[PDB]
TrEMBL record:
Protein name in UniProt: Di-/tripeptide transporter
Species lineage: Bacteria, Bacillati, Bacillota, Bacilli, Lactobacillales
Matches recorded under Gene3D superfamilies: MFS general substrate transporter like domains (1.20.1250.20)
Binding, L-glutamate: 22, 26, 408
Source organism of this protein record: Streptococcus thermophilus (strain ATCC BAA-250 / LMG 18311)
Domain Major facilitator superfamily (MFS) profile: 1-197
The keyword Repressor is annotated on this UniProt entry: no
Residues engaged in binding L-glutamine: 22, 26, 122, 408
Amino acid sequence: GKTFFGQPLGLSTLFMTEMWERFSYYGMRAILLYYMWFLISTGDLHITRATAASIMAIYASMVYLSGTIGGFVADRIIGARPAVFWGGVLIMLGHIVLALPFGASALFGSIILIIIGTGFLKPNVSTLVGTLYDEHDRRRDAGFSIFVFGINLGAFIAPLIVGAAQEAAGYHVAFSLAAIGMFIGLLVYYFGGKKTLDPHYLRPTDPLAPEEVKPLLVKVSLAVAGFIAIIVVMNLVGWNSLPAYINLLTIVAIAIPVFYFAWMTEHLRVVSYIPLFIAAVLFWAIEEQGSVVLATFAAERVDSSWFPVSWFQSLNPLFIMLYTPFFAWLWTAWPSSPTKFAVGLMFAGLSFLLMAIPGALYGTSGKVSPLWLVGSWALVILGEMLISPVGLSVAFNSQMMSMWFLSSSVGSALNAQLVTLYNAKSEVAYFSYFGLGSVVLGIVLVFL
Ligand SMILES: CCCCCCC/C=C/CCCCCC(=O)OC[C@@H](O)CO
Ligand SMILES: CCCCCCC/C=C\CCCCCC(=O)OC[C@H](O)CO
Ligand SMILES: CCCCCCC/C=C\CCCCCC(=O)OC[C@H](O)CO
Ligand SMILES: CCCCCCC/C=C\CCCCCC(=O)OC[C@H](O)CO
Ligand SMILES: CCCCCCC/C=C\CCCCCC(=O)OC[C@H](O)CO
Ligand SMILES: CCCCCCC/C=C\CCCCCC(=O)OC[C@H](O)CO
Ligand SMILES: CCCCCCC/C=C\CCCCCC(=O)OC[C@H](O)CO
Ligand SMILES: CCCCCCC/C=C\CCCCCC(=O)OC[C@H](O)CO
Ligand SMILES: CCCCCCC/C=C\CCCCCC(=O)OC[C@H](O)CO
Ligand SMILES: CCCCCCC/C=C\CCCCCC(=O)OC[C@H](O)CO
Ligand SMILES: CC(C)C[C@H](N)C(=O)O
């Protein structure tokens, strides 16, 4: 019978949908920092490169934090499938805003649209994949690996296409390609979804009961009021700069798990997530810095004179696709969950330790071979194969899905503070210090 790589034919619709969404996101991410660099150079954007780097991180942190609202709203209010649709619409509008002939004024608007939009699409498109299988179907694990393979496939071709278009035609044309990428995703999703997806997910699966509406409304109103109240207090005492707001968003992003863990002999299990969560946060911190710190390194310290330097952002998902057939075989030919989160952290630690070598050996005033980043990403992706749901083979909801991206949000929130420490003069110290600390903790948190 007809399948998509052994999976229900509905996976391909979700496959292509998320592939084109990740295309739009990572296509934009591949040049957004360089764009901010450009806006500063022209004197249009009045921030430092350190703040611009910090923005890239807190943006990423808010993107995956936003998913928690989206997962909840779909399950209880609007539905999984309309959430994906309207999520993509906002994403597309976000990229269109950047495509418009404006400068720094369009940044915030674009960022908010994509944050909100991705919050709706990302956890729900991931949830709809599990809806293709009944409960005890062995293929479910394989279906997600294919799905993540599509995530990285879009993450691979996006910098290559968008980055090249940027260096030939300009940023606005490049950002318009990202919008088009999402537009393609909507088309395939809308028409393909009607054919392959359950109509059951056009309505919420856990609809708010009558008595539940007001408590939720009070909870939300108090949260927004308090947030606004904090903003007001900040503006009065003078804490109203851009890094000030990043600090606030950082604390909020970090306080949410702290309060979530503090919420929850069964308690020894909960305490046993604490080091696993830390290992995850630190790993995705290092991993997400590829689009910031490594992107900075690529542009400043690497000879990329015969190709767009944004193409280095294709190295991350390339290795995931390369490692995929091996690990898929490796797990069938052959480690606990805490170990994989530790060894994965050690590999990420080694990816930074390696990057300290060229500056220590050759100095930082010159340029080095692309192979250093290639090797560095090879190491960090090697550990990602131990965390990310790929290389797998032969039930839940949207909110619990979001909880998974929550460790990446804390990592980037952590990055929003840490990436400001990276520059030309601290290169060797930054890499070696944070790489060594990550290996040590990787060795500490496995025995712990
Ligand atoms: C395509 C490589 C896949 C190998 C997977 C195993 C993990 C290997 C990591 C290699 C460490 C990177 C060393 C490369 C390096 O730093 O040399 C650069 C310099 O020699 C340029 O000529
Ligand atoms: C630039 C503004 C673009 C606005 C989008 C155009 C709106 C046209 C039709 C709205 C359809 C919304 C329902 C789609 C949906 O819920 O997804 C489920 C689909 O049936 C396929 O799964
Ligand atoms: C329903 C929305 C679907 C539209 C998909 C996104 C396409 C939007 C615009 C495509 C054309 C954009 C032209 C880019 C542009 O204005 O360049 C101006 C110069 O490059 C400025 O240096
Ligand atoms: C936890 C994040 C919440 C994000 C904001 C949610 C929007 C604020 C309040 C919910 C809007 C009202 C719900 C609409 C609704 O479906 O009520 C109908 C119920 O079925 C009544 O039985
Ligand atoms: C900015 C914070 C305040 C945001 C308030 C947004 C809340 C929006 C609507 C909440 C009002 C209650 C809606 C109830 C509702 O629509 O129920 C539908 C009925 O079931 C109709 O059959
Ligand atoms: C979800 C719980 C939130 C609890 C945190 C309470 C708010 C505490 C501090 C306000 C946010 C930080 C303001 C920005 C700041 O740190 O100073 C700004 C810079 O130092 C000035 O350039
Ligand atoms: C089947 C893999 C297809 C290959 C696609 C990978 C291309 C994506 C990004 C290119 C990153 C730049 C790598 C350049 C490189 O490794 O050359 C190093 C040479 O030693 C140059 O001195
Ligand atoms: C197994 C994968 C590769 C692991 C790399 C292990 C190398 C560990 C540390 C390399 C960085 C050593 C720092 C050298 C250093 O600090 O020099 C100081 C500067 O030259 C300025 O004085
Ligand atoms: C489970 C796979 C683990 C793979 C680790 C094996 C890699 C071990 C050490 C790589 C260290 C890279 C340093 C290379 C180096 O310093 O050469 C300098 C330049 O090549 C000069 O031409
Ligand atoms: C330029 C590529 C865009 C073309 C549309 C996407 C279709 C192309 C390739 C589909 C590749 C599917 C590979 C799935 C895969 O290998 O992972 C499954 C393994 O079992 C992982 O455990
Ligand atoms: C934090 C990671 C799990 C995110 C992944 N690279 C994705 O785009 O889905």
